[PDB]
Motif scaffolding. Structure first.
Motif, PDB file in Angstrom:
ATOM      1  N   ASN A 165     -38.582   0.545 -18.637  1.00  0.00           N
ATOM      2  CA  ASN A 165     -39.282   1.538 -17.879  1.00  0.00           C
ATOM      3  C   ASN A 165     -40.179   1.216 -16.531  1.00  0.00           C
ATOM      4  O   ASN A 165     -40.220  -0.190 -16.203  1.00  0.00           O
ATOM      5  CB  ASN A 165     -40.241   2.421 -18.518  1.00  0.00           C
ATOM      6  CG  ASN A 165     -39.748   3.316 -19.843  1.00  0.00           C
ATOM      7  OD1 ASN A 165     -38.725   2.765 -20.199  1.00  0.00           O
ATOM      8  ND2 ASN A 165     -40.399   4.398 -20.203  1.00  0.00           N
ATOM      9  N   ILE A 195     -29.497   3.391 -13.185  1.00  0.00           N
ATOM     10  CA  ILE A 195     -30.862   3.456 -13.888  1.00  0.00           C
ATOM     11  C   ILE A 195     -31.132   2.464 -14.991  1.00  0.00           C
ATOM     12  O   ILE A 195     -29.986   2.231 -16.138  1.00  0.00           O
ATOM     13  CB  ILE A 195     -31.125   4.864 -14.436  1.00  0.00           C
ATOM     14  CG1 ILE A 195     -31.423   5.750 -13.100  1.00  0.00           C
ATOM     15  CG2 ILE A 195     -32.122   4.813 -15.435  1.00  0.00           C
ATOM     16  CD1 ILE A 195     -30.310   6.031 -12.191  1.00  0.00           C
ATOM     17  N   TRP A 196     -32.060   1.490 -15.089  1.00  0.00           N
ATOM     18  CA  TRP A 196     -32.288   0.808 -16.165  1.00  0.00           C
ATOM     19  C   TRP A 196     -32.516   1.353 -17.425  1.00  0.00           C
ATOM     20  O   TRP A 196     -33.903   1.759 -17.435  1.00  0.00           O
ATOM     21  CB  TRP A 196     -33.432  -0.323 -15.642  1.00  0.00           C
ATOM     22  CG  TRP A 196     -33.387  -1.636 -16.601  1.00  0.00           C
ATOM     23  CD1 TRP A 196     -33.236  -1.747 -17.766  1.00  0.00           C
ATOM     24  CD2 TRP A 196     -34.046  -2.931 -16.220  1.00  0.00           C
ATOM     25  NE1 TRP A 196     -33.643  -2.969 -18.434  1.00  0.00           N
ATOM     26  CE2 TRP A 196     -34.098  -3.612 -17.254  1.00  0.00           C
ATOM     27  CE3 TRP A 196     -34.615  -3.417 -14.924  1.00  0.00           C
ATOM     28  CZ2 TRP A 196     -34.717  -4.801 -17.079  1.00  0.00           C
ATOM     29  CZ3 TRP A 196     -35.250  -4.545 -14.923  1.00  0.00           C
ATOM     30  CH2 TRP A 196     -34.894  -5.390 -16.161  1.00  0.00           C
ATOM     31  N   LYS A 197     -31.631   1.830 -18.128  1.00  0.00           N
ATOM     32  CA  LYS A 197     -31.959   2.480 -19.329  1.00  0.00           C
ATOM     33  C   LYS A 197     -32.429   1.688 -20.598  1.00  0.00           C
ATOM     34  O   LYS A 197     -32.498   2.422 -21.680  1.00  0.00           O
ATOM     35  CB  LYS A 197     -30.674   3.313 -19.964  1.00  0.00           C
ATOM     36  CG  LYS A 197     -30.221   4.287 -18.841  1.00  0.00           C
ATOM     37  CD  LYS A 197     -28.814   5.063 -19.269  1.00  0.00           C
ATOM     38  CE  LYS A 197     -27.626   4.166 -19.584  1.00  0.00           C
ATOM     39  NZ  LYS A 197     -27.640   3.016 -20.269  1.00  0.00           N
ATOM     40  N   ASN A 198     -33.140   0.433 -20.447  1.00  0.00           N
ATOM     41  CA  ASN A 198     -33.560  -0.367 -21.414  1.00  0.00           C
ATOM     42  C   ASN A 198     -35.179  -0.603 -21.041  1.00  0.00           C
ATOM     43  O   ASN A 198     -35.717  -1.498 -21.836  1.00  0.00           O
ATOM     44  CB  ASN A 198     -32.995  -1.584 -21.656  1.00  0.00           C
ATOM     45  CG  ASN A 198     -31.427  -1.282 -21.949  1.00  0.00           C
ATOM     46  OD1 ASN A 198     -30.416  -1.894 -21.829  1.00  0.00           O
ATOM     47  ND2 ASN A 198     -31.048  -0.038 -22.743  1.00  0.00           N
ATOM     48  N   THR A 251     -30.214  11.367 -11.503  1.00  0.00           N
ATOM     49  CA  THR A 251     -28.926  11.373 -12.612  1.00  0.00           C
ATOM     50  C   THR A 251     -29.231  10.020 -13.210  1.00  0.00           C
ATOM     51  O   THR A 251     -29.060   8.687 -12.403  1.00  0.00           O
ATOM     52  CB  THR A 251     -27.810  11.536 -11.877  1.00  0.00           C
ATOM     53  OG1 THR A 251     -27.867  12.999 -11.445  1.00  0.00           O
ATOM     54  CG2 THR A 251     -26.627  11.436 -12.990  1.00  0.00           C
ATOM     55  N   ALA A 252     -28.894   9.808 -14.462  1.00  0.00           N
ATOM     56  CA  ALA A 252     -28.974   8.443 -15.320  1.00  0.00           C
ATOM     57  C   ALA A 252     -27.735   7.445 -14.777  1.00  0.00           C
ATOM     58  O   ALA A 252     -26.816   8.126 -15.428  1.00  0.00           O
ATOM     59  CB  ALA A 252     -28.982   8.737 -16.632  1.00  0.00           C
ATOM     60  N   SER A 253     -27.512   6.634 -14.349  1.00  0.00           N
ATOM     61  CA  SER A 253     -26.590   5.758 -14.098  1.00  0.00           C
ATOM     62  C   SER A 253     -25.398   6.256 -13.073  1.00  0.00           C
ATOM     63  O   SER A 253     -24.197   6.776 -13.656  1.00  0.00           O
ATOM     64  CB  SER A 253     -25.763   5.312 -15.345  1.00  0.00           C
ATOM     65  OG  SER A 253     -26.609   4.355 -16.048  1.00  0.00           O
ATOM     66  N   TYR A 291     -31.313  -7.460 -17.311  1.00  0.00           N
ATOM     67  CA  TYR A 291     -30.425  -6.170 -17.398  1.00  0.00           C
ATOM     68  C   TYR A 291     -29.227  -6.837 -16.991  1.00  0.00           C
ATOM     69  O   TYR A 291     -28.975  -7.303 -16.046  1.00  0.00           O
ATOM     70  CB  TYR A 291     -30.911  -5.300 -16.563  1.00  0.00           C
ATOM     71  CG  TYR A 291     -30.255  -3.905 -16.773  1.00  0.00           C
ATOM     72  CD1 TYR A 291     -30.147  -3.268 -17.746  1.00  0.00           C
ATOM     73  CD2 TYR A 291     -29.552  -3.530 -15.605  1.00  0.00           C
ATOM     74  CE1 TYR A 291     -29.412  -2.101 -17.880  1.00  0.00           C
ATOM     75  CE2 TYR A 291     -28.532  -2.261 -15.527  1.00  0.00           C
ATOM     76  CZ  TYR A 291     -28.692  -1.740 -16.857  1.00  0.00           C
ATOM     77  OH  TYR A 291     -27.988  -0.420 -16.759  1.00  0.00           O
ATOM     78  N   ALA A 305     -35.735   3.473 -15.633  1.00  0.00           N
ATOM     79  CA  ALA A 305     -35.761   4.429 -16.520  1.00  0.00           C
ATOM     80  C   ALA A 305     -36.671   5.741 -15.860  1.00  0.00           C
ATOM     81  O   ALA A 305     -35.785   6.913 -15.750  1.00  0.00           O
ATOM     82  CB  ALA A 305     -36.761   3.888 -17.733  1.00  0.00           C
ATOM     83  N   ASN A 306     -37.934   5.467 -15.576  1.00  0.00           N
ATOM     84  CA  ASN A 306     -38.779   6.676 -15.098  1.00  0.00           C
ATOM     85  C   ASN A 306     -38.413   6.974 -13.549  1.00  0.00           C
ATOM     86  O   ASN A 306     -38.911   6.460 -12.685  1.00  0.00           O
ATOM     87  CB  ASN A 306     -40.144   6.465 -14.995  1.00  0.00           C
ATOM     88  CG  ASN A 306     -40.585   6.323 -16.502  1.00  0.00           C
ATOM     89  OD1 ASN A 306     -39.956   6.695 -17.576  1.00  0.00           O
ATOM     90  ND2 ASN A 306     -41.605   5.727 -16.921  1.00  0.00           N
TER      91      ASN A 306
END
Length: 122
Positions: free
Chosen positions: A92, A87-90, A79-81, A55, A74-75
């Protein structure tokens, strides 16, 4: 052959892997340097079993002395990022039943350190 601009800065810091989540949700890095370190765009290679995935980071925060940063896979529900962690959005939640091994490489691919979990029951 300039299809992109240049900028001289030390995108690096005295960051160490404090602890990896026992359930396998997140990886917690910890900057224990003497000065505010600019992340820039490091690449964290997360190994675990059979295969592995990395990442890359982004320039939106500076690591203060004693500042921790958590990478939620991910899970998370959070709050995303952030503004606080990332948050690793790539990729889970992996579940660290298999001893996960985190490889810390600088923005230019060069390597600082690498650490894994400990073989114990849950």
């Amino acid at each position: 052959m300039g299809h992109h601009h240049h900028h001289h800065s030390h995108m690096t810091g005295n960051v160490c892997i404090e602890e990896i989540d026992v359930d396998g949700k997140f990886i917690r890095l910890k900057n224990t340097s003497e000065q505010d370190q600019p992340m820039g765009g490091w690449e964290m290679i997360r190994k675990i079993g059979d295969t592995s995935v990395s990442y890359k980071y982004t320039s939106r925060y500076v690591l203060k002395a004693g500042q921790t940063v958590t990478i939620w896979a991910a899970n998370a529900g959070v709050t995303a990022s952030p503004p606080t962690d990332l948050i690793w959005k790539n990729q889970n939640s992996w579940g660290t039943g298999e001893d996960v091994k985190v490889i810390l490489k600088n923005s230019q691919g060069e390597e600082v350190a690498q650490r894994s979990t400990v073989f114990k029951t849950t």
